[PDB]
Amino acid sequence: SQETRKKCTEMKKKFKNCEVRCDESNHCVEVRCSDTKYTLC
DSSP, X not given: OXXXXXXXXXXXXXXXXXXXXXXXXXXXEXXXXXXXXXXXX
């Protein structure tokens, strides 16, 4: 529980230039830099 919101904060630390968006419905954090877009579930 809330491992996704933790992971979103962590991905924002690493990828603050990229669009790191938090979730809870899918428990998957999508990150969207420009050409590179990846989702850590």
